[PDB]
Amino acid sequence: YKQCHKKGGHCFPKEKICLPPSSDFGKMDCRWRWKCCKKGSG
């Protein structure tokens, strides 16, 4: 919501696929062990 939203993404745990496989962010403004995901074009 804070850092990731400028790019445009939602938080998901550290295990699922961020599809398309391009913009997967690490520790953004999620919690300690979760990540933020954004698509490319799809």
Swiss-Prot record:
Site (Involved in the interaction surface toward Kv): 1-2, 33-34
Domain of life of the organism encoding this protein: Eukaryota
Alphabetically ordered keywords of this record: Antibiotic, Antimicrobial, Disulfide bond, Fungicide, Ion channel impairing toxin, Myotoxin, Neurotoxin, Pharmaceutical, Potassium channel impairing toxin, Secreted, Signal, Toxin, Voltage-gated potassium channel impairing toxin
Span(s) of short sequence motif Nuclear localization signal: 2-18, 27-39
Function: Cationic peptide that possesses multiple functions. It acts as a cell-penetrating peptide (CPP), and as a potent voltage-gated potassium channel inhibitor. It exhibits antimicrobial activities, hind limb paralysis, and severe muscle necrosis by a non-enzymatic mechanism. As a cell-penetrating peptide, crotamine has high specificity for actively proliferating cells, and interacts inside the cell with subcellular and subnuclear structures, like vesicular compartments, chromosomes and centrioles. It penetrates into the cells as fast as five minutes after its addition to cell culture medium.
More details: Negative results: has no hemolytic activity. Has low harmful effects on normal mammal cells. Does not show activity against the filamentous fungi A.fumigatus and T.rubrum at concentrations up to 125 ug/mL. Does not directly affect voltage-gated sodium channels Nav1.1/SCN1A, Nav1.2/SCN2A, Nav1.3/SCN3A, Nav1.4/SCN4A, Nav1.5/SCN5A and Nav1.6/SCN8A.
Full protein name: Crotamine
Organism expressing this protein natively: Crotalus durissus terrificus (South American rattlesnake)
Taxonomic placement: Eukaryota, Metazoa, Chordata, Craniata, Vertebrata
Residues shown, of full length: 23 to 64 of 65
